[PDB]
Amino acid sequence: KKIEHKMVAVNGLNMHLAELGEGPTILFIHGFPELWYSWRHQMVYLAERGYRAVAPDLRGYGDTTGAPLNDPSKFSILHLVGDVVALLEAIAPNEEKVFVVAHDWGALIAWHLCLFRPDKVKALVNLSVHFSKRNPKMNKVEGLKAIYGEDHYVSRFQVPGEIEAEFAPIGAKSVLKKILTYRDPAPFYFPKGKGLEAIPDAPVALSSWLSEEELDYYANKFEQTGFTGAVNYYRALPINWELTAPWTGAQVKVPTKFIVGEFDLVYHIPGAKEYIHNGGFKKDVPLLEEVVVLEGAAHFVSQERPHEISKHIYDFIQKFT
Protein backbone atom coordinates (compact mmCIF):
# COMPACT_ATOMS: atom_id res chain seq x y z
CA LYS A 1 0.00 0.00 0.00
CA LYS A 2 1.10 3.59 -0.31
CA ILE A 3 1.07 5.80 2.80
CA GLU A 4 -2.51 6.86 3.49
CA HIS A 5 -3.49 10.36 4.64
CA LYS A 6 -6.51 11.45 6.65
CA MET A 7 -7.81 14.29 8.82
CA VAL A 8 -8.68 13.66 12.45
CA ALA A 9 -10.40 16.21 14.70
CA VAL A 10 -8.46 16.42 17.96
CA ASN A 11 -8.27 19.00 20.77
CA GLY A 12 -9.65 21.89 18.70
CA LEU A 13 -7.61 21.03 15.57
CA ASN A 14 -8.09 19.22 12.31
CA MET A 15 -4.98 17.06 12.41
CA HIS A 16 -3.34 15.48 9.40
CA LEU A 17 -2.30 11.89 9.98
CA ALA A 18 -0.15 9.80 7.68
CA GLU A 19 -0.51 6.05 8.14
CA LEU A 20 1.11 2.88 6.80
CA GLY A 21 0.87 -0.73 7.94
CA GLU A 22 -1.31 -2.85 10.22
CA GLY A 23 -0.60 -4.38 13.70
CA PRO A 24 0.38 -2.70 16.95
CA THR A 25 0.50 1.10 16.75
CA ILE A 26 3.69 3.14 16.66
CA LEU A 27 3.14 6.86 16.98
CA PHE A 28 5.90 8.98 15.40
CA ILE A 29 6.28 12.62 16.50
CA HIS A 30 8.38 15.04 14.37
CA GLY A 31 10.27 18.12 15.34
CA PHE A 32 11.36 21.54 14.07
CA PRO A 33 11.14 22.60 11.22
CA GLU A 34 9.92 19.22 10.06
CA LEU A 35 6.73 17.30 9.09
CA TRP A 36 5.24 13.78 9.24
CA TYR A 37 7.41 13.23 6.15
CA SER A 38 10.62 13.11 8.24
CA TRP A 39 9.53 9.60 9.17
CA ARG A 40 9.20 8.30 5.60
CA HIS A 41 11.97 5.63 5.92
CA GLN A 42 10.88 4.38 9.35
CA MET A 43 7.19 4.11 8.42
CA VAL A 44 8.14 1.72 5.59
CA TYR A 45 10.67 -0.20 7.62
CA LEU A 46 8.31 -0.80 10.54
CA ALA A 47 5.17 -1.36 8.42
CA GLU A 48 6.96 -4.04 6.54
CA ARG A 49 7.71 -5.79 9.86
CA GLY A 50 4.12 -5.97 11.10
CA TYR A 51 3.44 -2.61 12.82
CA ARG A 52 1.03 0.22 12.06
CA ALA A 53 2.99 3.43 11.66
CA VAL A 54 1.11 6.67 12.37
CA ALA A 55 2.69 10.06 11.90
CA PRO A 56 0.88 13.31 12.31
CA ASP A 57 1.66 16.85 11.40
CA LEU A 58 1.71 18.60 14.75
CA ARG A 59 -0.20 21.69 15.75
CA GLY A 60 0.93 24.61 13.51
CA TYR A 61 2.55 22.33 10.93
CA GLY A 62 1.90 21.04 7.48
CA ASP A 63 -1.65 19.98 6.76
CA THR A 64 -2.80 20.28 10.39
CA THR A 65 -5.19 23.21 10.86
CA GLY A 66 -6.98 25.21 13.53
CA ALA A 67 -4.28 26.52 15.89
CA PRO A 68 -4.28 30.31 15.96
CA LEU A 69 -0.94 31.51 14.56
CA ASN A 70 -1.50 34.94 16.06
CA ASP A 71 -1.46 33.51 19.66
CA PRO A 72 1.76 31.64 20.61
CA SER A 73 0.30 30.86 24.07
CA LYS A 74 -1.80 28.15 22.34
CA PHE A 75 1.42 26.31 21.43
CA SER A 76 2.26 25.42 25.02
CA ILE A 77 3.53 22.00 26.01
CA LEU A 78 0.15 21.39 27.69
CA HIS A 79 -1.71 22.11 24.46
CA LEU A 80 0.73 19.91 22.57
CA VAL A 81 0.42 16.94 24.88
CA GLY A 82 -3.40 17.45 24.88
CA ASP A 83 -3.27 17.09 21.07
CA VAL A 84 -1.39 13.80 21.32
CA VAL A 85 -3.60 12.30 24.07
CA ALA A 86 -6.74 13.12 22.06
CA LEU A 87 -5.12 11.79 18.90
CA LEU A 88 -4.41 8.46 20.54
CA GLU A 89 -7.99 8.25 21.87
CA ALA A 90 -9.25 8.83 18.34
CA ILE A 91 -6.89 6.55 16.35
CA ALA A 92 -5.90 3.79 18.74
CA PRO A 93 -9.12 3.09 20.72
CA ASN A 94 -8.23 -0.59 21.40
CA GLU A 95 -4.73 -0.13 22.68
CA GLU A 96 -4.33 1.02 26.23
CA LYS A 97 -0.62 1.61 25.52
CA VAL A 98 1.22 2.32 22.23
CA PHE A 99 4.79 2.67 21.16
CA VAL A 100 6.08 6.21 20.76
CA VAL A 101 9.01 7.35 18.63
CA ALA A 102 9.91 11.05 18.60
CA HIS A 103 12.48 13.63 17.65
CA ASP A 104 13.47 17.20 18.67
CA TRP A 105 10.23 19.16 19.71
CA GLY A 106 8.46 15.88 19.25
CA ALA A 107 10.75 14.32 21.85
CA LEU A 108 9.95 17.14 24.26
CA ILE A 109 6.30 16.44 23.68
CA ALA A 110 6.95 12.71 24.23
CA TRP A 111 8.82 13.29 27.52
CA HIS A 112 5.79 15.27 28.81
CA LEU A 113 3.34 12.71 27.43
CA CYS A 114 5.22 10.12 29.50
CA LEU A 115 5.19 12.29 32.57
CA PHE A 116 1.57 13.30 32.39
CA ARG A 117 0.13 10.02 31.01
CA PRO A 118 2.49 7.06 31.45
CA ASP A 119 -0.59 4.84 31.26
CA LYS A 120 -0.72 5.51 27.53
CA VAL A 121 2.87 4.68 26.52
CA LYS A 122 4.26 1.13 26.24
CA ALA A 123 7.80 2.20 25.46
CA LEU A 124 9.56 5.25 24.05
CA VAL A 125 12.33 5.92 21.56
CA ASN A 126 13.40 9.57 21.74
CA LEU A 127 15.78 11.18 19.35
CA SER A 128 18.02 14.26 19.84
CA VAL A 129 16.42 15.94 22.88
CA HIS A 130 17.29 14.46 26.26
CA PHE A 131 14.99 14.88 29.27
CA SER A 132 15.15 18.53 30.32
CA LYS A 133 15.12 18.75 34.03
CA ARG A 134 13.37 22.00 35.00
CA ASN A 135 15.84 24.72 36.10
CA PRO A 136 14.34 26.48 39.09
CA LYS A 137 16.14 29.74 38.40
CA MET A 138 15.01 30.66 34.92
CA ASN A 139 13.25 29.54 31.83
CA LYS A 140 14.99 28.02 28.82
CA VAL A 141 14.94 31.20 26.72
CA GLU A 142 16.69 33.23 29.44
CA GLY A 143 19.10 30.32 30.10
CA LEU A 144 20.13 29.97 26.45
CA LYS A 145 20.42 33.73 25.97
CA ALA A 146 22.72 34.02 29.02
CA ILE A 147 25.09 31.47 27.40
CA TYR A 148 24.85 32.33 23.68
CA GLY A 149 23.54 35.91 23.50
CA GLU A 150 20.74 37.70 21.65
CA ASP A 151 21.43 36.28 18.14
CA HIS A 152 20.90 32.67 19.34
CA TYR A 153 18.01 31.24 17.36
CA VAL A 154 15.80 30.63 20.41
CA SER A 155 16.12 34.27 21.35
CA ARG A 156 15.71 35.55 17.80
CA PHE A 157 12.57 33.41 17.46
CA GLN A 158 10.77 35.15 20.41
CA VAL A 159 8.99 38.17 18.98
CA PRO A 160 6.21 37.23 16.52
CA GLY A 161 6.90 38.41 13.01
CA GLU A 162 10.65 39.07 13.40
CA ILE A 163 12.14 35.79 12.21
CA GLU A 164 9.25 35.48 9.71
CA ALA A 165 10.37 38.76 8.15
CA GLU A 166 13.98 37.66 8.16
CA PHE A 167 13.06 34.51 6.26
CA ALA A 168 10.52 36.08 3.84
CA PRO A 169 12.94 37.27 1.17
CA ILE A 170 15.06 34.16 1.49
CA GLY A 171 12.25 31.69 0.82
CA ALA A 172 11.35 28.50 2.60
CA LYS A 173 13.53 26.33 0.38
CA SER A 174 16.77 28.06 1.14
CA VAL A 175 15.97 28.36 4.84
CA LEU A 176 15.10 24.65 5.04
CA LYS A 177 18.16 23.52 3.04
CA LYS A 178 20.42 25.51 5.31
CA ILE A 179 18.88 24.07 8.48
CA LEU A 180 18.44 20.48 7.22
CA THR A 181 22.07 20.27 5.97
CA TYR A 182 23.59 21.96 9.04
CA ARG A 183 26.29 19.90 10.81
CA ASP A 184 28.30 22.18 13.14
CA PRO A 185 27.84 21.59 16.84
CA ALA A 186 27.21 25.28 17.62
CA PRO A 187 23.69 26.62 17.90
CA PHE A 188 22.10 28.51 15.00
CA TYR A 189 22.49 32.31 15.02
CA PHE A 190 20.23 34.67 13.17
CA PRO A 191 21.57 38.23 13.44
CA LYS A 192 19.08 40.87 12.34
CA GLY A 193 19.17 41.50 8.65
CA LYS A 194 21.95 38.95 8.01
CA GLY A 195 19.65 36.17 6.84
CA LEU A 196 21.49 32.84 6.71
CA GLU A 197 25.00 34.33 6.65
CA ALA A 198 25.96 33.30 10.21
CA ILE A 199 25.29 29.59 9.56
CA PRO A 200 28.29 27.71 8.20
CA ASP A 201 28.00 25.23 5.33
CA ALA A 202 29.29 21.63 5.49
CA PRO A 203 30.90 19.96 2.46
CA VAL A 204 28.15 19.12 0.04
CA ALA A 205 28.96 15.36 -0.02
CA LEU A 206 27.85 15.17 3.61
CA SER A 207 24.19 16.03 2.68
CA SER A 208 23.80 13.44 -0.15
CA TRP A 209 21.13 11.82 2.15
CA LEU A 210 18.68 14.63 1.26
CA SER A 211 17.44 14.59 -2.28
CA GLU A 212 16.19 17.63 -4.09
CA GLU A 213 12.71 16.01 -4.21
CA GLU A 214 12.75 15.52 -0.44
CA LEU A 215 13.91 19.06 0.12
CA ASP A 216 11.10 20.32 -2.15
CA TYR A 217 8.51 18.46 -0.09
CA TYR A 218 9.45 20.48 2.97
CA ALA A 219 9.92 23.73 1.00
CA ASN A 220 6.56 23.57 -0.77
CA LYS A 221 4.73 22.95 2.51
CA PHE A 222 6.48 25.69 4.49
CA GLU A 223 6.00 28.08 1.57
CA GLN A 224 2.17 27.42 1.98
CA THR A 225 2.06 27.53 5.82
CA GLY A 226 4.89 29.90 6.65
CA PHE A 227 7.02 29.27 9.76
CA THR A 228 4.84 30.94 12.44
CA GLY A 229 3.18 27.74 13.64
CA ALA A 230 6.50 25.97 14.05
CA VAL A 231 8.34 28.89 15.61
CA ASN A 232 5.52 29.49 18.04
CA TYR A 233 6.66 26.38 20.01
CA TYR A 234 9.79 28.36 21.06
CA ARG A 235 7.65 31.42 21.88
CA ALA A 236 5.78 29.29 24.39
CA LEU A 237 8.97 28.24 26.23
CA PRO A 238 8.45 30.93 28.96
CA ILE A 239 4.94 29.78 29.76
CA ASN A 240 5.99 26.13 29.50
CA TRP A 241 8.50 26.70 32.27
CA GLU A 242 5.78 28.21 34.55
CA LEU A 243 3.17 25.55 33.68
CA THR A 244 5.50 22.61 34.37
CA ALA A 245 6.38 23.46 37.94
CA PRO A 246 4.12 20.68 39.33
CA TRP A 247 6.53 18.07 37.90
CA THR A 248 9.70 19.15 39.70
CA GLY A 249 11.35 15.97 40.99
CA ALA A 250 8.99 13.70 39.01
CA GLN A 251 10.44 10.78 37.09
CA VAL A 252 9.55 9.41 33.66
CA LYS A 253 8.51 5.81 34.38
CA VAL A 254 8.24 4.50 30.81
CA PRO A 255 10.88 2.17 29.27
CA THR A 256 13.02 4.41 27.10
CA LYS A 257 15.75 4.34 24.50
CA PHE A 258 17.53 7.58 23.65
CA ILE A 259 19.50 8.17 20.46
CA VAL A 260 21.52 11.26 19.43
CA GLY A 261 23.89 12.14 16.65
CA GLU A 262 27.52 12.97 17.56
CA PHE A 263 27.30 16.46 16.03
CA ASP A 264 23.76 17.46 17.10
CA LEU A 265 23.91 21.01 18.47
CA VAL A 266 21.47 19.96 21.23
CA TYR A 267 24.01 17.37 22.45
CA HIS A 268 26.61 20.14 22.80
CA ILE A 269 24.58 22.42 25.07
CA PRO A 270 26.80 23.00 28.14
CA GLY A 271 26.08 20.32 30.68
CA ALA A 272 24.11 18.07 28.31
CA LYS A 273 26.81 15.39 27.86
CA GLU A 274 27.35 15.23 31.59
CA TYR A 275 23.62 14.95 32.37
CA ILE A 276 23.14 12.33 29.65
CA HIS A 277 26.06 10.04 30.52
CA ASN A 278 26.99 10.56 34.15
CA GLY A 279 23.75 9.65 35.87
CA GLY A 280 21.43 12.65 35.88
CA PHE A 281 19.45 11.36 32.92
CA LYS A 282 19.08 7.86 34.42
CA LYS A 283 17.82 9.38 37.72
CA ASP A 284 15.07 11.24 35.89
CA VAL A 285 14.31 8.32 33.53
CA PRO A 286 14.94 5.14 35.63
CA LEU A 287 14.00 2.70 32.83
CA LEU A 288 16.40 4.32 30.34
CA GLU A 289 18.43 1.83 28.29
CA GLU A 290 22.05 2.45 27.41
CA VAL A 291 22.24 5.69 25.45
CA VAL A 292 23.06 5.46 21.74
CA VAL A 293 25.28 8.00 20.06
CA LEU A 294 25.46 7.76 16.28
CA GLU A 295 29.02 8.35 15.18
CA GLY A 296 29.45 10.75 12.31
CA ALA A 297 25.82 11.96 12.40
CA ALA A 298 24.28 15.36 13.14
CA HIS A 299 20.75 16.42 14.19
CA PHE A 300 18.39 14.93 11.57
CA VAL A 301 19.17 11.32 12.31
CA SER A 302 15.96 9.74 11.04
CA GLN A 303 16.76 11.02 7.52
CA GLU A 304 20.56 10.98 7.71
CA ARG A 305 20.92 7.52 9.19
CA PRO A 306 17.58 5.92 8.29
CA HIS A 307 18.67 2.30 8.52
CA GLU A 308 20.33 2.77 11.92
CA ILE A 309 17.34 4.60 13.37
CA SER A 310 14.74 2.21 11.84
CA LYS A 311 16.57 -0.80 13.14
CA HIS A 312 17.20 0.75 16.55
CA ILE A 313 13.45 1.28 16.76
CA TYR A 314 12.54 -2.22 15.69
CA ASP A 315 15.00 -3.98 17.97
CA PHE A 316 13.84 -1.98 20.99
CA ILE A 317 10.12 -2.46 20.51
CA GLN A 318 10.64 -6.17 19.86
CA LYS A 319 11.85 -6.44 23.51
CA PHE A 320 8.24 -5.91 24.71
CA THR A 321 6.74 -9.15 23.27
mmCIF file with all atom_site columns, C-alpha atoms in Angstrom, residues 6 8 17 19 25 27 52 54 86-95:
data_model
loop_
_atom_site.group_PDB
_atom_site.id
_atom_site.type_symbol
_atom_site.label_atom_id
_atom_site.label_alt_id
_atom_site.label_comp_id
_atom_site.label_asym_id
_atom_site.label_entity_id
_atom_site.label_seq_id
_atom_site.pdbx_PDB_ins_code
_atom_site.Cartn_x
_atom_site.Cartn_y
_atom_site.Cartn_z
_atom_site.occupancy
_atom_site.B_iso_or_equiv
_atom_site.pdbx_formal_charge
_atom_site.auth_seq_id
_atom_site.auth_comp_id
_atom_site.auth_asym_id
_atom_site.auth_atom_id
_atom_site.pdbx_PDB_model_num
ATOM 1  C CA . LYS A 1 6  ? -6.507 11.452 6.652  1.00 0.00 ? 6  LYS A CA 1
ATOM 2  C CA . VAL A 1 8  ? -8.684 13.659 12.446 1.00 0.00 ? 8  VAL A CA 1
ATOM 3  C CA . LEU A 1 17 ? -2.304 11.894 9.983  1.00 0.00 ? 17 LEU A CA 1
ATOM 4  C CA . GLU A 1 19 ? -0.508 6.048  8.145  1.00 0.00 ? 19 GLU A CA 1
ATOM 5  C CA . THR A 1 25 ? 0.499  1.102  16.752 1.00 0.00 ? 25 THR A CA 1
ATOM 6  C CA . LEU A 1 27 ? 3.136  6.865  16.984 1.00 0.00 ? 27 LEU A CA 1
ATOM 7  C CA . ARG A 1 52 ? 1.027  0.224  12.058 1.00 0.00 ? 52 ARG A CA 1
ATOM 8  C CA . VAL A 1 54 ? 1.115  6.670  12.365 1.00 0.00 ? 54 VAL A CA 1
ATOM 9  C CA . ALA A 1 86 ? -6.744 13.120 22.060 1.00 0.00 ? 86 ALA A CA 1
ATOM 10 C CA . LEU A 1 87 ? -5.124 11.791 18.897 1.00 0.00 ? 87 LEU A CA 1
ATOM 11 C CA . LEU A 1 88 ? -4.410 8.457  20.535 1.00 0.00 ? 88 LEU A CA 1
ATOM 12 C CA . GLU A 1 89 ? -7.988 8.248  21.873 1.00 0.00 ? 89 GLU A CA 1
ATOM 13 C CA . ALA A 1 90 ? -9.252 8.833  18.342 1.00 0.00 ? 90 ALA A CA 1
ATOM 14 C CA . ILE A 1 91 ? -6.888 6.553  16.346 1.00 0.00 ? 91 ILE A CA 1
ATOM 15 C CA . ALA A 1 92 ? -5.897 3.788  18.743 1.00 0.00 ? 92 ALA A CA 1
ATOM 16 C CA . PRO A 1 93 ? -9.120 3.092  20.724 1.00 0.00 ? 93 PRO A CA 1
ATOM 17 C CA . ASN A 1 94 ? -8.233 -0.587 21.399 1.00 0.00 ? 94 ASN A CA 1
ATOM 18 C CA . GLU A 1 95 ? -4.727 -0.132 22.678 1.00 0.00 ? 95 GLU A CA 1
#
